[PDB]
Design an enzyme around this catalytic site. Structure first.
Site, PDB file in Angstrom:
ATOM      1  CB  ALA B  90      10.557  43.100  27.886  1.00 58.21           C
ATOM      2  N   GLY B 135      13.238  43.644  23.787  1.00 53.16           N
ATOM      3  CA  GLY B 135      13.088  44.258  25.091  1.00 53.16           C
ATOM      4  C   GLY B 135      13.600  43.373  26.205  1.00 53.16           C
ATOM      5  N   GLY B 137      16.042  40.943  25.821  1.00 50.22           N
ATOM      6  CA  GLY B 137      17.484  40.814  25.700  1.00 50.22           C
ATOM      7  C   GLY B 137      18.231  42.084  26.052  1.00 50.22           C
ATOM      8  CG  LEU B 243      35.128  31.637  29.858  1.00 50.25           C
ATOM      9  CD1 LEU B 243      35.400  30.261  29.330  1.00 50.25           C
ATOM     10  CD2 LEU B 243      33.830  31.663  30.642  1.00 50.25           C
ATOM     11  CD  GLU B 245      44.621  31.630  29.626  1.00 47.96           C
ATOM     12  OE1 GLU B 245      44.882  31.597  28.408  1.00 47.96           O
ATOM     13  OE2 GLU B 245      45.119  30.833  30.442  1.00 47.96           O
TER      14      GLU B 245
HETATM   15  N1  LIG Z   1      21.091  35.431  15.444  1.00 46.45           N
HETATM   16  C1  LIG Z   1      19.821  35.278  15.792  1.00 46.45           C
HETATM   17  N2  LIG Z   1      19.073  36.383  16.115  1.00 46.45           N
HETATM   18  C2  LIG Z   1      17.782  36.246  16.470  1.00 46.45           C
HETATM   19  C3  LIG Z   1      17.198  35.000  16.514  1.00 46.45           C
HETATM   20  N3  LIG Z   1      15.918  35.165  16.893  1.00 46.45           N
HETATM   21  C4  LIG Z   1      15.687  36.480  17.092  1.00 46.45           C
HETATM   22  N4  LIG Z   1      16.837  37.159  16.822  1.00 46.45           N
HETATM   23  C5  LIG Z   1      17.070  38.603  16.917  1.00 46.45           C
HETATM   24  O1  LIG Z   1      16.514  39.115  18.106  1.00 46.45           O
HETATM   25  C6  LIG Z   1      16.198  40.474  17.913  1.00 46.45           C
HETATM   26  C7  LIG Z   1      15.000  40.873  18.757  1.00 46.45           C
HETATM   27  O2  LIG Z   1      15.112  40.291  20.032  1.00 46.45           O
HETATM   28  P1  LIG Z   1      14.100  39.133  20.486  1.00 46.45           P
HETATM   29  O3  LIG Z   1      14.855  38.006  21.134  1.00 46.45           O
HETATM   30  O4  LIG Z   1      13.327  38.641  19.294  1.00 46.45           O
HETATM   31  O5  LIG Z   1      13.084  39.843  21.508  1.00 46.45           O
HETATM   32  P2  LIG Z   1      13.282  39.655  23.087  1.00 46.45           P
HETATM   33  O6  LIG Z   1      14.743  39.666  23.451  1.00 46.45           O
HETATM   34  O7  LIG Z   1      12.590  38.387  23.515  1.00 46.45           O
HETATM   35  O8  LIG Z   1      12.559  40.915  23.760  1.00 46.45           O
HETATM   36  P3  LIG Z   1      10.987  41.099  23.535  1.00 46.45           P
HETATM   37  O9  LIG Z   1      10.788  42.213  22.542  1.00 46.45           O
HETATM   38  O10 LIG Z   1      10.336  41.468  24.841  1.00 46.45           O
HETATM   39  O11 LIG Z   1      10.403  39.820  23.001  1.00 46.45           O
HETATM   40  C8  LIG Z   1      15.900  40.624  16.437  1.00 46.45           C
HETATM   41  O12 LIG Z   1      16.624  41.714  15.928  1.00 46.45           O
HETATM   42  C9  LIG Z   1      16.384  39.347  15.793  1.00 46.45           C
HETATM   43  O13 LIG Z   1      17.309  39.650  14.785  1.00 46.45           O
HETATM   44  C10 LIG Z   1      17.947  33.884  16.188  1.00 46.45           C
HETATM   45  O14 LIG Z   1      17.443  32.770  16.220  1.00 46.45           O
HETATM   46  N5  LIG Z   1      19.262  34.022  15.827  1.00 46.45           N
HETATM   47  N1  LIG Z   2      58.102  25.011  23.704  1.00 51.09           N
HETATM   48  C1  LIG Z   2      56.825  24.858  24.119  1.00 51.09           C
HETATM   49  N2  LIG Z   2      56.136  25.950  24.511  1.00 51.09           N
HETATM   50  C2  LIG Z   2      54.859  25.845  24.924  1.00 51.09           C
HETATM   51  C3  LIG Z   2      54.227  24.530  24.953  1.00 51.09           C
HETATM   52  N3  LIG Z   2      52.980  24.719  25.403  1.00 51.09           N
HETATM   53  C4  LIG Z   2      52.830  26.043  25.647  1.00 51.09           C
HETATM   54  N4  LIG Z   2      53.953  26.707  25.355  1.00 51.09           N
HETATM   55  C5  LIG Z   2      54.175  28.155  25.505  1.00 51.09           C
HETATM   56  O1  LIG Z   2      53.663  28.565  26.768  1.00 51.09           O
HETATM   57  C6  LIG Z   2      53.019  29.831  26.665  1.00 51.09           C
HETATM   58  C7  LIG Z   2      51.655  29.715  27.324  1.00 51.09           C
HETATM   59  O2  LIG Z   2      51.796  29.777  28.738  1.00 51.09           O
HETATM   60  P1  LIG Z   2      50.842  28.873  29.656  1.00 51.09           P
HETATM   61  O3  LIG Z   2      51.628  28.181  30.738  1.00 51.09           O
HETATM   62  O4  LIG Z   2      50.128  27.870  28.790  1.00 51.09           O
HETATM   63  O5  LIG Z   2      49.799  29.929  30.269  1.00 51.09           O
HETATM   64  P2  LIG Z   2      49.234  29.801  31.766  1.00 51.09           P
HETATM   65  O6  LIG Z   2      48.462  28.518  31.935  1.00 51.09           O
HETATM   66  O7  LIG Z   2      48.315  30.960  32.044  1.00 51.09           O
HETATM   67  O8  LIG Z   2      50.394  29.874  32.718  1.00 51.09           O
HETATM   68  C8  LIG Z   2      52.897  30.147  25.188  1.00 51.09           C
HETATM   69  O9  LIG Z   2      53.720  31.273  24.886  1.00 51.09           O
HETATM   70  C9  LIG Z   2      53.417  28.931  24.457  1.00 51.09           C
HETATM   71  O10 LIG Z   2      54.307  29.329  23.417  1.00 51.09           O
HETATM   72  C10 LIG Z   2      55.047  23.388  24.509  1.00 51.09           C
HETATM   73  O11 LIG Z   2      54.590  22.230  24.496  1.00 51.09           O
HETATM   74  N5  LIG Z   2      56.296  23.632  24.117  1.00 51.09           N
END
Ligand SMILES: Nc1nc2c(ncn2[C@@H]2O[C@H](COP(=O)(O)OP(=O)(O)OP(=O)(O)O)[C@@H](O)[C@H]2O)c(=O)[nH]1
Ligand SMILES: Nc1nc2c(ncn2[C@@H]2O[C@H](COP(=O)(O)OP(=O)(O)O)[C@@H](O)[C@H]2O)c(=O)[nH]1
Ligand SMILES: Nc1nc2c(ncn2[C@@H]2O[C@H](COP(=O)(O)OP(=O)(O)OP(=O)(O)O)[C@@H](O)[C@H]2O)c(=O)[nH]1
Ligand SMILES: Nc1nc2c(ncn2[C@@H]2O[C@H](COP(=O)(O)OP(=O)(O)O)[C@@H](O)[C@H]2O)c(=O)[nH]1
Ligand SMILES: [Mg+2]
Ligand SMILES: [Mg+2]
Lengths: 429, 432, 429, 432
Positions: B90, B135, B137, B243, B245
């Site tokens: 890109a 481009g 990303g 995820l 949450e």
């Molecule tokens: N954190 C981190 N950033 C990276 C790394 N490699 C590239 N970048 C970042 O990627 C940005 C540019 O995006 P690229 O991934 O290189 O390019 P692209 O997404 O392939 O898009 P093209 O331009 O088409 O190649 C730059 O600003 C870099 O900082 C990496 O290994 N780690």
């Molecule tokens: N007393 C006690 N509280 C807990 C424990 N584990 C989790 N909790 C409480 O439970 C709450 C989390 O709710 P949870 O059931 O894990 O979330 P859900 O899976 O989305 O329903 C938190 O506020 C914790 O403080 C435990 O072993 N003992």
């Protein structure tokens, strides 16, 4: 007779319950397998309340384990005492609750609630005379708040004469363990006032202080907090499972402790609680167990009782003790703390004495307090709810799951209706 | 059974995934051959034999970065139909990533996503690793996030963007690619975790004591972020967090879904000693403005929601002992509508060390995912970089000539001006 | 019945008290563990006054140990007889008193006084009928002077009918062990005249002479000085713990010895005191124990009784002795020293005889003298106070802690009110 | 649990700390690697393993003295982020220590103080080791004592200054650096213990019988002073005395907080015999004017407060036998308002001997910390050294050119003239 179906919702309720069935199996002499290995026949006299006897002289728990993610179920079945459960009871989803009340009560939980109720109804038919159901969950989670309060609403329609006591972990004052826990608690307390006969408010902040200050545990894990709740959970039903000089059950602690059908939000307490070093420096007497309960630092809810008045108090005792020494102390706390009890209920202490102590102890207690001190528990949440709801923040994760803003307004009005009632009977004369 | 597939777009996306999938094989004992001498299931599908293959889609429009993967140490690990190449890149052009070159293989990538999603029984969501500068990303991701929002919609789609630094830029038209990709992915992504290069340049110099860090060294730290986010799925934890949450606890408004990642501890072996690293010590590291991984001043903004993802030998009482001190501090201030500004996740597994890595083997860690007001200054810079270049209409003929309208730039700038005032609308306090 | 809660404040009070509980455990046959290992049942007849019986037949001291630095608490709990105490009682701060009255009475001590009173009130409820509280501290320190006199003011408000006897180490005439000890003593004597029923003035200079001249100890450590105080401390309450032919308690020694409610500043004394060589060259008779007390060189306060008059004198005896031999000698010292006693109190000697001697002795005594000779004790301090206060030296360490110059003027006026009273009844006829 | 961190500023501060932290590892059995084959806690924080690291901040604006620490025997002992360097020294310039070079890393040093103070649960106070002569020890300390009085305020901040000798000076502008650092640290320090080089030159020659003593030899004696002051925290003693008790017993007025340290016995191995060294013998050593460690005549002044810090096999009766004789002597005279002029501390631990040290292994010792009127003659000299140089305005262009006003010298001189009359106001007797 009088069997109890234990329901476990959420990650929290599964982790409490897996410690709860560790206590009940120890009190009744049950191995990891499910076979009886005790010595006394008093353990098997009322074995049926928490156990179904299977073929081959094995006892399985009458526990129904509910979650929306399969991570907690693998922790149970692979841990100790996990092979004791029936594999039919592990009713789990795949998605996870998403830390969401609406995804637990409407979207994913409603897809799984019929998988649970068909197991609830299957356990309830095997029971001879059903006592009632206990649920262990939280209020800040998604499964414990959404899926848990969905089960209560669907059971109370099917079993309206039974008792539905919940052991609900309430969000703490200082730390927040969830960004949307004012939303999850308030939508659950809307369900708990209409469908539970009693509810046991537990704070994680309070159990941190009890492990630190009282038990001198510098490093308490969750399993040390769950051992405090599980000893309280077995302490409420210990006169239902064992003979005693003054027996109670889940209905005696319901009738004596609930003067008004909304006001059923309790704070628990346990005694004795000693460290390893400081246990030989203290005598286990009934006046010591009494004065350890009725203070503030032994409440498993993070609210000072001195900012309110006890409406009703249940102190369930265990162990071979004398009734005069009990009845003197229950009077003694009512004299010197007469401003701390409500006036228009004379003699507001329920006493239950079992004959069987816990394992390794000479005698024990269990405090069940129905105070106006939990109005500060709901003044805090309704303040944290109104601060978030006035900007409609985090609302589109719940509005996007089929809910409106009217559900939040009615649930927050219902909580401020409840706080006004605890404010009313605290000042009533 | 809580499966989660991950997409790697651009050169930045693949080179992050070269460190991520190296890390996951060490956490699960997986050989580079896919062998091992039941918790892998969220990222690994298993064949009939004892060979585990990843749930990854590596896509680039140029074949250079993929052919190093196809000939590297992890040749035998990856399913060769997942390593998707184009012919011409890109080439720092959003229009080539979205219209010209991107449309040629977008149906090939979605066909490989769907073959992964069919063998996933519990597919939670997506992990799109890309950058804002390139481009591919910017262009191909914004093409892809449109298509996944059509085909899936309700799946939680997490992005891990390499946000462009204020004073460090490696390409000239990075202010063009970043605005044009953000206008598109705004209504299609659910939560996008900003990561900057200049801040991890600072952390590898100061905290890790490396004079000369490579992109290899930066991708090790970003791999530890994603391994801490997905630690609750892959391992049994005391307090788990999924995820679904993350998007619930961190996204108060559907426009604002741009938190910033922050990892701690970042220490070497010479500083593995000389400090005990309690859970209070590593938590005060995260709210320190020098340890964040986006070049912003969090003291110049207000945190809207924080997400502390602990792992390892972490005791939940000392967690509350750590966080309750931070609400008392004045330098960490929150927003008026948010008294409850923490999500805590505890896992039992310590973060492992990759051999040849520059981090030390610690007993505990923390990935702070904090959604803050202070990222509005980052978009205020990037609009100022956009308003200088577009006023002279520089580089527009490279984009119009590949399928874009000139008015589409003003459409993205008015939307970003609408996005900038959203942080101003949230950051103020409430009346009465 | 008649239980005593022992409170230890300061480094000094902890070092005296750790020797005091070494004496009481030896008199009652108590091991380092806390278990009874004596032979007679007379030891357990009144065991409860200084002990709470714990479970497993173990006796814990009813001692409350208070300090502002944790250095002294580690010396107690790691030394011998340190494992006998309850670990709940060790209430210590981190900062240290800073050798400051204001940092002990206002700034750091007020932060810790509620941690002590909640243990004081906990011990006071376990007592059946409370006798009263004894406090061991100094007047030159910061915790013993500031935190110690803070506890007396907060207990006398809560327990106004009880006795509050203090064993206060008073600054010596010759050496000064603290640069600001005229400031620390004068601000404490302001508190002691209003809140204690009796107070036992002990000087370190006097105990140095008794170990050197009388006991022939060329090298006495603090633990040898503390053994002299602890034998006096147990000697005041020995007729409360053991049967006797003429019993006294802490109230009989309060009523007989305090003619005016301000004039309750006593000098103690002990007999017999012999060396190792010179113990076989002396017979232990009541006329020998009498003449050893009533001189000047056996006073544990560094003030000559010959410069004043005894108002009232208590001579508590221990051991199987005859009452005529006692009553002859108490008359005998009143005849030949009739100028040394006050005139308008006829027969100003209180006699108490226990039946139980100390360990390893045939008979013993304990002198409690209420003389006008301690007016020289307060003429010296009020001179050393006025010399320092007239230049306002060292004042900003106390003014900077919330105090004004008015507090020093009222405390120095209160001491010169007190010296005028001892001058009054010395010359009154 | 009574933690106490120590700061080492300038070349004089670090080279003292090279002898101090060598001494502390011998007193606690600590290896140079931080290992040992629970009383250490006031100066040592412990890692997860058996490695104890000090609570020290070594700061210099030049890297020469620190790189000898970083390559010395105690390389492995110190946390490498604590050893803070600059690039160019303050270079005997107060303005470079306080304005030019000092402001560059003052935020780095305070950040390292705060990371120590967070892992201290019982932090009592500070031990700032510096000198009055050097630019770093005068400029950077006076910058640092301002910042610690803002951030902490109520903590007891003890200074251990190398006071400049009357006839022995190693730099030319020592009368400038000493006045300018004392004007600043006066309202910010709580108690500053004066130590002189010429007096310890005299003690190492006479009392230790060394013809040629080094700065290595002088720093051994100053290490024994600080080890005797902090002996009550680190070890259980019969009569303990904390850092808050020193400022209470020795500072009668908030301006006058300049006592002088005096240690005894100072003997070699050939004089380890031939005398029995009772507690009366070593106490009469301290009030002898030849054994003090500041070149002043205490017979020419009056002691305001003395602090005898005994340690070792010391019997408290013979303590009173020693001190009561000294109040009878006419040559040791006190001030009229102070009849009570002694603070006594007894510890059970004898002072240990460093191998290669020039002191002998004794059973007992004494660190006399006497606040006296006789130090007014020391400031009367130093003002006379200041009034000669400033009248010709010598060296002022080195200080004005780095951020200072010329009127600020007259501000410091009027304050020191106000400080000199304070000793005259206290030293006189009271009327009526
Ligand atoms: N954190 C981190 N950033 C990276 C790394 N490699 C590239 N970048 C970042 O990627 C940005 C540019 O995006 P690229 O991934 O290189 O390019 P692209 O997404 O392939 O898009 P093209 O331009 O088409 O190649 C730059 O600003 C870099 O900082 C990496 O290994 N780690
Ligand atoms: N007393 C006690 N509280 C807990 C424990 N584990 C989790 N909790 C409480 O439970 C709450 C989390 O709710 P949870 O059931 O894990 O979330 P859900 O899976 O989305 O329903 C938190 O506020 C914790 O403080 C435990 O072993 N003992
Ligand atoms: N007692 C003692 N004094 C020392 C030692 N080393 C240097 N000094 C004194 O320190 C004074 C000068 O201060 P320095 O530490 O050398 O200089 P600085 O504090 O680093 O400031 P700069 O001039 O910027 O280097 C001299 O008068 C020396 O007498 C030492 O090891 N022991
Ligand atoms: N008789 C006696 N007096 C002591 C002992 N220890 C300390 N003292 C006296 O206590 C005073 C010190 O007070 P202290 O409690 O240590 O100071 P604080 O910690 O600030 O309260 C000094 O005057 C000592 O003479 C001891 O063992 N016996
Ligand atoms: Mg590319
Ligand atoms: Mg230097």
């Amino acid at each position: 007779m009088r069997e109890i179906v234990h329901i476990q919702a959420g990650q929290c309720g599964n982790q409490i319950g897996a410690k709860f069935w560790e206590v009940i199996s120890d009190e009744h002499g049950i191995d990891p397998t499910g076979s009886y290995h005790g010595d006394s026949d008093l353990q098997l006299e009322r074995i049926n309340v928490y156990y179904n006897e299977a073929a081959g002289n094995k006892y399985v728990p009458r526990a129904i384990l509910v979650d929306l993610e399969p991570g907690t179920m693998d922790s149970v079945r692979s841990g100790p005492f996990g092979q004791i459960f029936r594999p039919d009871n592990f009713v789990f989803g795949q998605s996870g609750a998403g830390n969401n009340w609406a995804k637990g009560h409407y979207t994913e939980g409603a897809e799984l609630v019929d998988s649970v109720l068909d197991v609830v109804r299957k356990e309830s038919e095997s029971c001879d005379c059903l006592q009632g159901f206990q649920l262990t969950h939280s209020l800040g989670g998604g499964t414990g708040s959404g899926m848990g309060t969905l089960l209560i609403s669907k059971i109370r329609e099917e079993y309206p004469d039974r008792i539905m006591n919940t052991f609900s972990v309430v969000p703490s004052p200082k730390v927040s363990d969830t960004v949307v826990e004012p939303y999850n608690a308030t939508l659950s307390v809307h369900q708990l006032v209409e469908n539970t006969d009693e509810t046991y408010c537990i704070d994680n902040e309070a159990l941190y202080d009890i492990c630190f200050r009282t038990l001198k545990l510098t490093t308490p894990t969750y399993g040390d907090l769950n051992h405090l709740v599980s000893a309280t959970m077995s302490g409420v039903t210990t006169c239902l499972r064992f003979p005693g000089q003054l027996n109670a059950d889940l209905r005696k602690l319901a009738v004596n402790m609930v003067p008004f059908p909304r006001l059923h939000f309790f704070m628990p307490g346990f005694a004795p609680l000693t460290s390893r070093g400081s246990q030989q420096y203290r005598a286990l007497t009934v006046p010591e167990l009494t004065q350890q309960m009725f203070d503030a630092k032994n409440m498993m809810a993070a609210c000072d009782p001195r900012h309110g008045r006890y409406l009703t108090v249940a102190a369930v005792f265990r162990g071979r003790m004398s009734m005069k020494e009990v009845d003197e102390q229950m009077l003694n706390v009512q004299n010197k703390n007469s401003s701390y009890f409500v006036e228009w209920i004379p003699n507001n202490v329920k006493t239950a004495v079992c004959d069987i102590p816990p394992r390794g102890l000479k005698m024990s207690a269990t405090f069940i307090g129905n105070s106006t001190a939990i109005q500060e528990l709901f003044k805090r949440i309704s303040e944290q709810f109104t601060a978030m709801f006035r900007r409609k923040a985090f609302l589109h994760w719940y509005t996007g799951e089929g809910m409106d803003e009217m559900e939040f307004t009615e649930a927050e009005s219902n909580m401020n209706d409840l706080v006004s009632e605890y404010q009313q009977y605290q000042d009533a004369t | 059974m809580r499966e989660c597939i991950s997409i790697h777009v651009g050169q930045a996306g693949v080179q992050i995934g070269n460190a991520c999938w190296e890390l996951y094989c060490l956490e699960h004992g997986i050989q580079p051959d896919g062998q091992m001498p039941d918790s892998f299931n969220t990222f690994f599908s298993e064949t009939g034999a004892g060979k585990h293959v990843p749930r990854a889609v590596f896509v680039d429009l140029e074949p250079t970065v993929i052919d190093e993967v196809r000939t590297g140490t992890y040749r035998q690990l990856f399913h060769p139909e997942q390593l998707i190449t184009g012919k011409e890149d890109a080439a720092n052009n959003y229009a080539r990533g979205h219209y010209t070159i991107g449309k040629e293989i977008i149906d090939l990538v979605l066909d490989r996503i769907r073959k992964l999603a069919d063998q996933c029984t519990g597919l939670q969501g997506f992990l799109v690793f890309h950058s804002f500068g390139g481009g591919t990303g910017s262009g191909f991701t914004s093409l892809l996030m449109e298509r996944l929002s059509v085909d899936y919609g309700k799946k939680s789609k997490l992005e891990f963007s390499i946000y462009p630094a204020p004073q460090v830029s490696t390409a000239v038209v990075e202010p063009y690619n970043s605005i044009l990709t953000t206008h598109t992915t705004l209504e299609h992504s659910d939560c996008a975790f900003m990561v900057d290069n200049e801040a991890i340049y600072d952390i590898c110099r100061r905290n890790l004591d490396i004079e000369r860090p490579t992109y290899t060294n930066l991708n090790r730290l970003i791999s530890q972020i994603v391994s801490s986010i997905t630690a609750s799925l892959r391992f049994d934890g005391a307090l788990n967090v999924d995820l679904t949450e993350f998007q619930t606890n961190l996204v108060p408004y559907p426009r604002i879904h741009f938190p910033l990642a922050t990892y701690a501890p970042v220490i070497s072996a010479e500083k593995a000693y000389h400090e005990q690293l309690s859970v209070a010590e590593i938590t005060n590291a995260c709210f320190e403005p020098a340890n964040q991984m986006v070049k912003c001043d969090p003291r110049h903004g207000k945190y809207m929601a924080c997400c502390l993802l602990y792992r390892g030998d972490v005791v939940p009482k000392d967690v509350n002992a750590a966080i309750a001190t931070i609400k008392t501090k004045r330098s960490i201030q929150f927003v008026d509508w948010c008294p409850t500004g923490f999500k805590v996740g505890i896992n039992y597994q310590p973060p492992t060390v990759v051999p040849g890595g520059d981090l030390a083997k610690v007993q505990r860690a923390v990935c702070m995912l904090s959604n803050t007001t202070a990222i509005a200054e980052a978009w205020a810079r990037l609009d100022h970089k956009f308003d200088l270049m577009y006023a002279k209409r520089a580089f527009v003929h490279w984009y119009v000539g590949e399928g874009m309208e000139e008015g589409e730039f003003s459409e993205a700038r008015e939307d970003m001006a609408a996005l900038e005032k959203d942080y101003e609308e949230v950051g103020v306090d409430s009346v009465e």
